[PDB]
């Protein structure tokens, strides 16, 4: 439901890496291909892997690099933190002026989503304060990359894991995970599912300006008590501030949206087609109106 885009510049950099029975997206710059190192793991390896050892039990032929119907013969491999590095026998002719950089939560950036290796548009987003990312466009697209363009492509992220809570964890282009997340499978989603109130509210406003109103018709402090009980994020004045422009058009005040939300929370449910309160959309995604 978000808004995709082009950027053929980055789509030319995408390739896929296969090892054993796994295939994920990889980034192809010059004659190097980058992708999550877990690609080399079998389902069982993931329960507790020693990557240094598993890598030893591999060779350049264990990996197949595909650029569509084209193959990139691997001539070398190594490991950089949580990234698997591969050397191919030819460099990407469409490599842009690039640099790898590490960012912080809140900073917006572009992500090129893929469906079975096939690019499906780039989306705007940012990592939550806990360094995870909320966005359906990352489901079933391990390895996609995040970036920012300025004149030079600044790569700042690579998708690695989809948490069971519907949130994703990734690394920077140096293979260092953003946050406490690891690349083995255990329970690490703790505190990763508190519902983002600001987004739910904006999502409600997007609903108003679309015919949805049956859910319409409290104070901050009072409201947050309900926020606490239902594991929603505490609404701040700054959050109300942001929803100002949205409150403007719609004509419904923020606290009156909270009163609306508070009801939906205490007395559950279709809104915008969805039968659930969506929280993956920022006020900004909605300002597309």
Swiss-Prot record:
Catalyzed chemical reaction(s): TSAVLQ-|-SGFRK-NH2 and SGVTFQ-|-GKFKK the two peptides corresponding to the two self-cleavage sites of the SARS 3C-like proteinase are the two most reactive peptide substrates. The enzyme exhibits a strong preference for substrates containing Gln at P1 position and Leu at P2 position
Residue stretches making up the Peptidase C30 domain: 1-289
Active site: 38 (for 3cl-pro activity), 142 (for 3cl-pro activity)
Recorded superkingdom: Viruses
Compartmental location: Host cytoplasm; Host Golgi apparatus
Residue numbers on the Cytoplasmic membrane side: 1-289
Variant or mutagenesis effect after changing residue 185 to P: In strain: Isolate BJ02
General function of this protein: Cleaves the C-terminus of replicase polyprotein at 11 sites. Recognizes substrates containing the core sequence [ILMVF]-Q-|-[SGACN]. May cleave human NLRP1 in lung epithelial cells, thereby activating the NLRP1 inflammasome pathway. Also able to bind an ADP-ribose-1''-phosphate (ADRP). May cleave host ATP6V1G1 thereby modifying host vacuoles intracellular pH.
Subunit structure of this chain's protein: Monomer. Homodimer. Only the homodimer shows catalytic activity.
Name of protein: 3C-like proteinase nsp5
Originating organism: Severe acute respiratory syndrome coronavirus (SARS-CoV)
Whole-protein coverage range: 3244 to 3539 of 7073
């Amino acid at each position: 439901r978000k808004m995709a885009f082009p950027s053929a510049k980055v789509e030319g950099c995408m390739v896929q890496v296969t090892c054993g029975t796994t295939t994920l997206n990889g980034l192809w710059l010059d004659d190097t291909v980058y992708c999550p190192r877990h690609v080399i793991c079998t389902a069982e390896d993931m329960l507790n892997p020693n990557y240094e050892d598993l890598l030893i039990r591999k060779s350049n032929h264990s990996f197949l690099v595909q650029a569509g119907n084209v193959q990139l013969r691997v001539i070398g491999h190594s490991m950089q933190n949580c990234l698997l590095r591969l050397k191919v026998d030819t460099s990407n002719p469409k490599t842009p002026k690039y640099k790898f950089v590490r960012i912080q939560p809140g900073q917006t950036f572009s992500v090129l989503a893929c469906y079975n290796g096939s690019p499906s548009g780039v989306y705007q987003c940012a990592m939550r304060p806990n360094h995870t990312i909320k966005g359906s466009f990352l489901n079933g697209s391990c390895g996609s990359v995040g970036f920012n363009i300025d004149y030079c492509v600044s790569f700042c992220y690579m998708h690695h894991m989809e948490l069971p809570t519907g949130v994703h964890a990734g690394t920077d282009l140096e293979g260092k995970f953003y946050g406490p997340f690891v690349d083995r499978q255990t329970a690490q989603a703790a505190g990763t599912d508190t519902t983002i109130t600001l987004n739910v509210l904006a999502w409600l406003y997007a609903a108003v300006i679309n015919g949805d109103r049956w859910f319409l018709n409290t104070t901050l402090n009072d409201f947050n008590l309900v926020a606490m009980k239902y594991n929603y994020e505490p609404l701040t004045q700054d959050h109300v501030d942001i929803l100002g422009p949205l409150s403007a058009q719609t004509g419904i005040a923020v606290l009156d949206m909270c009163a609306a939300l508070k009801e939906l929370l205490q007395n559950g449910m279709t809104i915008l087609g969805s039968t659930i309160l969506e929280d993956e959309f920022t006020p900004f995604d909605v300002v597309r109106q």
